[PDB]
Symmetry: C3
Subunit: 134 residues, 3 copies
């Protein structure tokens, strides 16, 4: 059920691990329970590396939420959040969503959003053509 | 503290692990660091098994971000990214957000987004009633 | 490159574990594979402890997806979903995205969205000034 490879890779549910930690399971594979506000951290060793949460089917890329390598030039620039989609073979089809760290601007199909919501494409509303002035 | 049960469930910080990996902590329960792009890869062994990140409170479903089981019919159709909300007992309230993998279309309360942003219901904007022509 | 220490924290690839589980690897780092719909669960032990997925860079907060601190007072109130952003020194900068658990309302820069999409700020659309009635 659990093995440790010569290079240094820990496999749970498998004897041939592919990652540092490789867990095989049914249903809830891993459960991380905290006695306080917190959870799982995805960290990087350098600001030019991208911490990613990657959703795969049949080990083929499908979706991912990551912190991109936009450089931190000062004033909270760079390291923005992006939700990326991938084709049926695992090659990136582009950032579906991008949130800028410094401004919080939410871009749909937009790499550099200049508005609080910035949509590049078409917009559909089920109830009318105008926003409601909140 | 660390325990390896007979069925094959590794419990870190607990003796009765319910998942294949079951980690218990305070604050930072788990930390996954990368030296490139990666961190947490959620994979499934078949195209009709949905890889999910599940947020729970007192072991009751609150939220989830997953790749749904929409049929991959070709041309990057299917396997879309859904964010789901659950009621106070943990039962699903529906996909609050759905992004199409083929198109990148972003549906808010819209299971079949037809526009780059597609909202079903009301739209509220603090700064007026129209989109700014970008 | 796998140790257990006094406080019983398991570290993989490190010998100084700082969390209950601490993994560092080249690339993927941790892969959770499920044989059925399921994946990783982040849980808490009380309704006021908030499960979170925290993206850091050099162990400094950059982004967050977490169940927020709104009080569960009945009718699926409270414990909304939040995408938070942090400044260059890891301090909270603001909740970019907030989804109401009870209503599914999607607020951009709005902690209590009162519309299916509630935007506090400006809105830019590439194709025009108006929604397309769906």
């Amino acid at each position: 059920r659990m093995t440790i490879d010569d290079v240094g890779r820990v496999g749970v549910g498998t004897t041939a691990p592919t990652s540092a930690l490789h867990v095989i399971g049914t249903g809830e594979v891993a459960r991380f329970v905290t006695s306080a506000t917190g959870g799982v951290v995805i960290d990087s060793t350098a600001l030019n590396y991208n911490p990613s949460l990657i959703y795969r089917k049949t080990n083929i890329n499908r979706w991912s939420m990551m912190v991109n390598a936009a450089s931190e030039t000062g004033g909270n620039a760079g390291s923005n959040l992006s939700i990326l989609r991938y084709d049926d073979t695992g090659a990136t089809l582009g950032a579906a969503v991008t949130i800028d760290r410094a401004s919080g601007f939410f871009g749909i199909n937009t790499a550099a959003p200049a508005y609080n919501i910035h949509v590049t494409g078409t917009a559909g509303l089920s109830t009318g053509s105008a926003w409601t002035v909140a």
